[PDB]
Amino acid sequence: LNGGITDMLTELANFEKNVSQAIHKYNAYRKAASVIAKYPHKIKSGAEAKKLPGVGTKIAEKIDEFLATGKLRKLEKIRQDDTSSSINFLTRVSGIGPSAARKFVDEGIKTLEDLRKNEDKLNHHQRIGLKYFGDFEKRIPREEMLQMQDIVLNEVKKVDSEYIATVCGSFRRGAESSGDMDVLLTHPSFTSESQPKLLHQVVEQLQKVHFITDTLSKGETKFMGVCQLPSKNDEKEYPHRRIDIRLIPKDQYYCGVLYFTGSDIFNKNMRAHALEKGFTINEYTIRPLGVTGVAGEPLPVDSEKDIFDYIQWKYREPKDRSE
DNA sequence: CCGACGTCGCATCAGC
DNA sequence: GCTGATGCGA
DNA sequence: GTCGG
Numbered sequence: 001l002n003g004g005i006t007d008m009l010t011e012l013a014n015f016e017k018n019v020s021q022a023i024h025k026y027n028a029y030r031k032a033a034s035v036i037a038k039y040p041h042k043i044k045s046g047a048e049a050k051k052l053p054g055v056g057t058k059i060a061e062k063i064d065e066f067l068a069t070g071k072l073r074k075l076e077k078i079r080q081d082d083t084s085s086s087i088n089f090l091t092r093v094s095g096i097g098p099s100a101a102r103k104f105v106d107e108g109i110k111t112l113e114d115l116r117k118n119e120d121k122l123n124h125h126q127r128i129g130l131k132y133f134g135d136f137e138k139r140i141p142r143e144e145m146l147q148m149q150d151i152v153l154n155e156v157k158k159v160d161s162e163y164i165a166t167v168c169g170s171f172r173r174g175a176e177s178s179g180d181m182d183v184l185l186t187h188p189s190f191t192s193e194s195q196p197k198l199l200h201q202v203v204e205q206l207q208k209v210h211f212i213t214d215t216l217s218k219g220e221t222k223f224m225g226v227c228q229l230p231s232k233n234d235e236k237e238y239p240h241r242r243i244d245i246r247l248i249p250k251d252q253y254y255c256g257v258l259y260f261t262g263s264d265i266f267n268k269n270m271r272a273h274a275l276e277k278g279f280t281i282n283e284y285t286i287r288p289l290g291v292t293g294v295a296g297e298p299l300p301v302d303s304e305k306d307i308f309d310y311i312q313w314k315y316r317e318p319k320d321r322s323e
Numbered sequence: 324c325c326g327a328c329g330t331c332g333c334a335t336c337a338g339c
Numbered sequence: 340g341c342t343g344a345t346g347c348g349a
Numbered sequence: 350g351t352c353g354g
């Protein structure tokens with residue numbers, strides 16, 4: 001419908017982030033691309049698009065050029081640019097951001113092939129990102145996500161039956177596919193007022209049954225790694241997937257569950273309705289805003305519905321949280 | 324005009 | 340060796 | 350790049 005415009009803006013967004021290192025221009029282009037993608041008409045002019053929140057003068061100008069020529073001169077130019085295109089591409093490797101990609105291209109390292117010839121110049125994360133470059137860019141069918149959930153909940157309960165684990169993200173919202181697996185973990189012995197090994201014992205077990213295959217980062221509260229479903233007999237093996245496991249205190253668990261379930265826009269909207277009701281919501285707590293704007297102590301939470309009631313909101317199932 | 328634009332855990336770097 | 344900054348992907 | 354105080 002407006003795919004040409006949105007693809008154009010998305011591509012401009014990446015070059016800003018990865019090449020120009022302008023994170024705010026990156027978000028600006030993506031916000032404009034998002035608001036246009038939801039627009040239910042084929043855009044006839046830049047002036048028409050400028051009415052949308054996130055589309056200003058510059059983008060309205062760029063849209064006019066695209067509509068009249070079928071392309072953007074600047075975008076066509078940076079596409080052909082060997083240095084810029086290589087920098088932007090290298091950032092597709094997990095662990096290689098704008099800064100690392102810049103350094104690599106500066107010293108002649110421009111392709112995955114070049115990265116493969118230069119392992120010693122890559123850190124642990126970047127090696128894993130390189131190894132699973134293809135797998136990481138694939139999506140995960142819900143059926144596989146269900147099998148992944150089966151393993152996680154089973155092994156977690158096996159370590160300690162008092163653990164509470166919840167797979168959040170787009171999966172919990174009931175999406176037909178997901179980009180990764182977000183696991184939230186808590187235990188009755190862990191509160192805010194509070195063992196340093198609650199997360200480790202879970203990771204260890206998942207590694208023992210060969211579910212977790214690699215580790216990108218691991219601390220006392222947050223694990224980021226790689227997992228893979230078991231090979232079904234003599235059939236083709238499953239792609240490696242990204243998995244995060246977060247250990248959250250019991251009293252902050254459901255604010256965490258609410259947040260990490262999403263979606264992006266839903267959180268933004270829910271934070272807005274909360275503020276107009278005199279409440280502030282982060283990933284940890286929900287707090288009442290005093291008469292002068294001072295935030296008081298965090299209110300007790302025992303479920304998602306508690307937060308919904310606090311701001312006088314009708315509870316919405318994760319299924320209906322796309323926005 | 325000009326500052327905000329989310330904030331943070333972990334790995335690793337820079338400086339001392 | 341320690342501390343704070345930076346990069347990175349959330 | 351866009352918005353808004």
Ligand SMILES: Nc1ccn([C@H]2C[C@H](O)[C@@H](COP(=O)(O)NP(=O)(O)OP(=O)(O)O)O2)c(=O)n1
Pocket residue numbers: 168169170171177178179180182259260261262263264267
């Ligand atoms: N911009 C962001 C990023 C993260 N989040 C918190 C809520 C997002 O819905 C959520 C989970 O992040 P995510 O996995 O990167 N995105 P999401 O699960 O919606 O998409 P997939 O990666 O599962 O395809 O974390 C947020 O509210 N806003």
Ligand SMILES: [Mn+2]
Pocket residue numbers: 168169170178179180181182
């Ligand atoms: Mn996710």
Ligand SMILES: [Mn+2]
Pocket residue numbers: 169180182244
């Ligand atoms: Mn995620």
Ligand code: NA
Pocket residue numbers: 090091092093094095096097
């Ligand atoms: Na990257």
Ligand code: NA
Pocket residue numbers: 091092093
């Ligand atoms: Na990337």
